[PDB]
Design a protein around this ligand. Structure first.
Ligand SMILES: [Zn+2]
Lengths: 783, 128, 400
């Protein structure tokens, strides 16, 4: 079988959602950040956040709510995993005996159903009587919270509205009542129903359906003092308490859609809104002797790309960000000279989303450093992750970094980038704007404008910024000397995208060369389509021109010329060459191996993967082992059947490996951070940097037996089976993980209790206690 | 000519079946020439009526072969000729079903099936 | 005849019971009807609680168990019986094979070259070759077959059909790729495009709790036509516009889809792609009727099991009463035997065994055909055959 080993290096660092409450103790306030696949608990203090415990949980924490059932001094959590592994948690620490017992557990997966495009919606009623959950269109699963509920009971309620944009629970009314912005074919509306646990069905609700703006996207449940709910749209905010339709059309709201909301005071008189432009508005609910007098909006300032906002003591608003590094902003009652109430105080580091990276050994020609293209929009930057825990030097680019490639001989990093520009005047000045020199392409062949950001290896300043033509998309970049010519060249794969046209059908391949002090294009080559990616295949530039995976040869006259063709693809997004093998990992056609034969001068399809998946990133591990990953957060290894009775078997790769990574792999580059078999670092959207290391069969049988024994002892929070978490989850099939080893569980062995260590090793006597302590230390030093 | 009759009936029916399925299709592209709302539509309607007419002609000759079979006519030939009348009444029933779109062809299907039901009851009354 | 009363050759062993016989017999009598318009398991439950009995109560529940079991037989296990769920599946199979035959036949003569070759990607021999499964008539119902056909269908469209609507669908992919890499979702800005067929939400009314169907990404449906197609799909899974009365008028414009194509594109090519779009919707309609077959299946079984569990639950009180006061042998026998009948999907044999076991259980003449026939006259003024007819519920006996 294919024997590999996956181990995390940087734990996931993007925030999916955070909710505040009283978890650790009845007096103290707690802030519960939930980075993907691991929640973190903190105790808020005037000095700042104080970590107390970091739990690693076998599942993606999608819905996270803090509620207090009647009779509980604590609050209880409700973690709902993306694989539908709901489990109610509770804090229990007794003199440094920090432990989170699971009060209730159990899967709530609907066997049959169509998942909603909006995503999973999880809502708690204010009176703590039901757990509202939306998982599939036309259905509303309800989980009661009766004191006696050790195994979560689930009963779906049929629901008439088909497309629900948001559901919430109205405060005040004794009957638990939902309010939901559903989508009728004519337009979207808001209705209310009374959910009855006793009758297992809805009932006629408090009010009725009032046409809301065609973009209505949030429901906010205003507390008892005022009641009702605010249905935020894109241009008009509104209020629906007692058919008291109160609405406003602020101009500042029109600039961008609102994303997240937060309750400043229990009185519900102030709500802090946030959008992805990076702004913190406030819908001050001016009270009215209490009904509502009016709603108004004022911009407080600028934080990072908001994901989840929570208000804490002393006016310190936590800005959980996903597309950029998180902030602990503080509100000032008085205006600063600049005109922004907010002031940055602390800056946590988010490496996500990683789009492309490369291992560059510069400092010591050894122990290389990962220069990753982290972030997007205003938060885009270059993180220089380096072993040493892992040191992160951040170099802001003020604009989304797309691709990166390294030219050793010229001492520079080419970085394609794009900055959103108003229909043209720039929005926020960027690093590209402030470049030491710049030029525009003279090629005669909101709107983003791509350009290339060459960067010195030392000061990491932007030496040049070659802005491309109008309506130009640069998709790919490689630094390689082409064929005979000794000079290495920067080749950018550009593609025209006209707003009037739909498909990108005209493209261009431009080759550049970094002369000392000035950048200059060498040649150009128009192509019929977008060049999704390119690689330097044996002195020749293999270019992915839509589905046509052409291979271009370089002439002594400095002009690219085509030589071969292939058309068995839909879109050849991912091209990774290894020797002669060409891996054209497409979108829906999964992996399709190709090979160039010099005697024939043509490509041949040696094999093709047999599973209709959607690839994200792909890499040639070894000549016989082929890895990849898809949208379904799963890593799979395909093997070429070297010898077979029929060519049909040789042409069909066997999927020897299956494994649920839980992230969206976005890049695969070789090499390892440790100074001085194999190491394929991968960077995920959530800011994880993992490592794929091949293993011998002898350790694989040892580590797999080890995995099983550790599963029995190390109980999971929420009572999730480990094997259920690692299972290959895809809409059609769910097969157990095989061919991979979860390294995080194997590395748990270092600080499981010594008597529990004797528990696991007592059976396995491969040919004991310290013998296994040594081999896990052999495994922990690879990352 | 007891068994040579079984030979000619079966093979001629194979030809009918082939011509009829070919026919169905020429219609289907005529019917895909629908949702044109031109030359193809007219030339296909032109090829439409051609094929239909020729099929009707061949079946009418087979209907004459049927009357030849009946005037010449034991149980194994009764059942064998029953198969002929059965799928003949079936194939023209399908032809009528199509002819009912009727851009003639249907009444020719009618008069042939009228000879069919005549022959059918004429044989059933004696075979019983 | 004597069997015109509730107690027929295999019928339920009073005024309401005659209505039940009218319900079961109308199934076969009507020249044709929509199986989905015929009651489902939920409505069967509804009627089951509304049954009228006249003078034990345990025998009354045991009689209503025969009602539901005979009902299930006629509704689902009745392959080739009037308007049944499996009968729709098999008739559709014939439409499917034939449609792909038409596609293989494409290019026989002037009836409608490498462009044709890309069209024959739909052919079952090709799709089975890519999955590696042996070419088989049953393979169409496999989920993987439907998945593979999708990639070929949209491979076809991007090579030959580059229009405006399809243009938008292709651009979508490029943008979606960028938006997924940064961990975001496609925005609602570009809603200027007419709604794509996939985005629509339909719900089958026969089994309302089936969840929203994942509409197949059939292309080239005009906004207006998209409504009618989705409309019929929700009502009777296209039964009305493909069989039954006046099917010929709908047939003028296509069996699974309306006849439709884009302007300014070679019609010869258009018909070819249109055959692929029809075969793509055929495969959907097969897998759906399969799912509604299974959801009546499971439901019926569950209902029967619940009922028979109550039967042994109540008759045990009758056994203790007779002891305090051969018939005792018969009662305990069927008690144990009903438990032994697990109705495991066999399923017809267990169902037939059930009613035979109930037939072996003694009943008062007040419940036998004597009174039943008498009551019939006033108003006017077996499992063995079922076992034979009931065919295996497994798909590829039905496909045969
Ligand atoms: Zn089109």
């Amino acid at each position: 079988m294919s024997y590999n080993y996956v181990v995390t290096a940087q734990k996931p660092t993007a925030v999916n959602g955070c909710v505040t409450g009283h978890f650790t103790s009845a007096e103290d306030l707690n802030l519960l950040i939930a980075k993907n696949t691991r929640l973190e608990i903190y105790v808020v203090t005037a000095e700042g956040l104080r970590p107390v415990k970091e739990v690693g949980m076998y599942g993606k924490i999608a819905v996270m709510e803090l509620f207090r059932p009647k009779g509980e001094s604590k609050d209880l959590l409700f973690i709902l995993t993306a694989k539908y592994n709901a489990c109610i948690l509770e804090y229990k620490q007794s003199g440094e005996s920090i432990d989170i017992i699971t009060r209730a557990h159990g899967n709530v997966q609907d066997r049959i159903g169509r998942p909603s495009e909006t995503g999973i919606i999880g809502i708690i009623d204010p009176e703590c009587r039901m757990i509202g959950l939306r998982l599939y269109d036309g259905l509303f699963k309800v989980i009661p919270l009766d004191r006696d509920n050790k195994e979560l009971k689930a009963f779906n309620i049929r629901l008439e509205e088909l497309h629900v944009i948001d559901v919430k629970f109205l405060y005040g009314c004794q009957a638990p009542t939902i309010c939901f912005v559903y989508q009728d074919p004519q337009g979207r509306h808001v209705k209310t129903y009374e959910v009855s646990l006793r009758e297992k069905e809805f009932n006629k609700g408090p009010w009725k359906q009032e046409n809301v703006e065609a973009e209505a996207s949030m429901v906010i449940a205003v507390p008892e003092p005022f009641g009702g709910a605010i249905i935020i749209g894109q241009e008009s905010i509104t209020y629906h308490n007692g058919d008291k339709y109160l609405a406003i059309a602020p101009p500042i709201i029109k600039q961008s859609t609102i994303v997240c909301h937060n309750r400043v005071d229990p009185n519900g008189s102030r709500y802090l809104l946030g959008d992805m432009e990076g702004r913190l508005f406030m819908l001050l609910l001016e009270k009215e002797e209490v009904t509502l007098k009016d709603l108004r909006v004022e911009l407080l300032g600028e934080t990072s790309i908001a994901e989840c906002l929570t208000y804490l003591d002393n006016g310190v608003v936590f800005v959980g960000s996903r597309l950029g590094d998180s902030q602990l902003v503080k509100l000032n009652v008085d205006s600063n000279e600049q005109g922004s109430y907010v002031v940055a105080m602390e800056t946590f580091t988010n490496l996500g989303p990683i789009v492309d990276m490369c291992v560059v050994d510069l400092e010591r020609q050894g122990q290389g450093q990962l220069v990753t293209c982290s972030g997007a929009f205003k938060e885009g930057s270059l993180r220089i992750i380096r072993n040493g825990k892992l040191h992160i030097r951040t170099v802001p680019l003020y604009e989304s970094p797309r691709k990166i490639c390294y030219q050793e001989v010229s001492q520079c990093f080419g970085v394609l980038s794009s900055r959103i520009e108003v229909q043209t005047t720039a929005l926020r000045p960027s690093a590209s704007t402030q470049a030491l020199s710049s030029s525009v392409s003279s090629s005669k062949l909101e709107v983003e404008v791509h350009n290339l950001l060459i960067i010195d290896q030392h000061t990491f300043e932007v030496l040049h910024a070659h802005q491309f033509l109008q309506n130009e998309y640069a998709l790919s970049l490689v630094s390689c000397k082409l064929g005979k010519d000794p000079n290495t060249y920067f080749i950018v794969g550009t593609a025209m995208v006209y707003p009037e046209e739909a498909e990108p059908k005209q493209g261009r391949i431009v080759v550049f060369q970094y002369s000392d002090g000035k950048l200059q294009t060498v040649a150009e080559k128009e192509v019929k389509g977008a060049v999704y990616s390119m690689v330097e295949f044996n002195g020749k530039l293999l270019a992915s021109i839509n589905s046509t995976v052409r291979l271009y040869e370089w002439t002594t006259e400095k002009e690219l010329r085509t030589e071969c063709n292939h058309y068995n693809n839909i879109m050849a997004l991912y091209l990774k060459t290894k020797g002669d093998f060409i891996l054209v990992g497409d979108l829906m056609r999964s992996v399709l191996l190709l090979a160039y034969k010099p005697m024939e001068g043509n490509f041949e399809e040696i094999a093709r993967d047999f599973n209709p998946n959607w690839m994200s990133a792909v890499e040639i591990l070894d000549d016989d082992n082929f890895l990849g990953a898809e949208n379904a957060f799963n890593l799979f290894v395909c093997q070429k059947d070297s010898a077979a009775t029929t060519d049909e078997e040789r042409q069909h790769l066997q999927e020897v490996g299956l494994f649920h990574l839980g992230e969206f792999v976005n890049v695969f580059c070789h090499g390892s951070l440790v100074m001085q078999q194999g190491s394929v670092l991968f960077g995920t959207v959530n800011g994880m940097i993992g490592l794929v290391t091949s293993l011998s069969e002898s350790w694989y049988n040892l580590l797999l037996d080890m995995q099983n024994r550790l599963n029995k002892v190390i109980k999971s929070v929420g009572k999730i089976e480990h094997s259920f978490w690692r299972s290959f989850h895809t809409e059609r099939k769910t097969e157990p993980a095989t061919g991979f080893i979860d390294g995080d569980l194997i590395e748990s062995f270092l600080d499981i209790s010594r008597p529990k260590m004797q528990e696991v090793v007592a059976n396995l006597q491969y040919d004991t206690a310290d013998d296994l302590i040594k081999v896990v230390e052999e495994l922990t030093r690879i990352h | 000519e007891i068994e040579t009759r079984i030979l000619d009936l079966q093979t001629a029916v194979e030809a009918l079946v082939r011509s009829i399925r070919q026919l169905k299709d020429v219609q289907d592209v005529f019917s895909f020439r629908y949702t044109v709302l031109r030359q193809l539509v007219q030339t296909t309607a032109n090829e439409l009526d051609r094929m239909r007419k020729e099929v009707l002609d061949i079946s009418k000759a087979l209907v004459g072969r049927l009357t030849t079979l009946v005037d010449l006519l034991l149980e194994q030939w009764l059942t064998a000729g029953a198969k002929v009348l059965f799928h003949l009444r079936q194939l023209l029933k399908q032809l009528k079903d199509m002819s009912l779109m009727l851009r003639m062809f249907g009444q020719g299907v009618d008069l042939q099936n009228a000879q069919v039901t005549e022959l059918l009851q004429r044989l059933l009354q004696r075979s019983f | 005849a004597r069997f015109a009363t509730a107690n027929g050759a295999y019928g339920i062993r009073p005024a309401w019971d005659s209505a039940i016989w009218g319900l079961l017999r109308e199934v076969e009598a009507v020249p044709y009807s929509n199986p989905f318009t015929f009651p489902t398991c939920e409505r069967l439950e509804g009627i089951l609680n509304r049954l009228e009995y006249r003078p034990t109560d345990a025998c009354r529940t045991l009689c209503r168990a025969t009602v539901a079991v005979q009902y299930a037989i006629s509704i689902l296990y009745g392959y080739d019986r009037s308007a049944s769920v499996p009968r729709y599946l098999r008739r559709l199979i014939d439409e499917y094979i034939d449609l792909q035959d038409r596609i293989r036949r494409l290019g026989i003569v002037p009836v409608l070259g490498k462009d044709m070759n890309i069209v024959q990607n739909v052919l079952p021999e090709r799709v089975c070759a890519q999955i590696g499964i042996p070419f088989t008539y049953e393979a169409c119902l496999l989920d993987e077959y439907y998945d593979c056909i999708e990639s070929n269908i949209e491979q076809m469209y991007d090579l030959l059909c580059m229009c405006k609507e399809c243009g938008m669908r292709r651009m979508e992919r490029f943008e979606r790729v960028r938006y997924n890499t940064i961990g975001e979702r496609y925005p609602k800005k570009k809603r200027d495009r007419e709604r794509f067929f996939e985005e629509n939400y339909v719900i089958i009314h026969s089994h309302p709790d089936l969840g929203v169907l994942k509409l197949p990404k059939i292309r080239h449906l005009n906004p207006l036509q998209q409504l009618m197609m989705c409309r019929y799909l929700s009502k009777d899974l296209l039964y009305d516009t493909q069989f039954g009365p006046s099917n010929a008028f709908s047939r003028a414009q296509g069996v699974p889809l309306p006849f439709s194509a884009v302007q300014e594109t070679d019609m010869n090519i258009a018909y070819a792609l249109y055959l692929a779009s029809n075969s793509y919707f055929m495969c959907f309609l097969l897998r759906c009727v399969r799912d509604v077959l299974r959801h009546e299946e499971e439901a019926f079984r569950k209902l029967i099991l619940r009922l028979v569990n109550e039967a042994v639950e109540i008759i045990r009180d009758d056994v203790n009463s007779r002891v305090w006061a051969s018939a005792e042998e018969r009662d305990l026998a069927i008690a144990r035997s009903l438990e032994e009948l697990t109705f495991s999907n066999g399923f017809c044999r267990d169902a037939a065994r059930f009613l035979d076991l109930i037939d072996a259980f003694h009943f008062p003449k007040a419940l036998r055909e004597h009174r039943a026939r008498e009551d019939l006259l006033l108003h006017t003024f077996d499992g063995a055959v079922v076992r034979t007819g009931g065919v295996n519920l497994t798909d590829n006996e039905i496909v045969r």
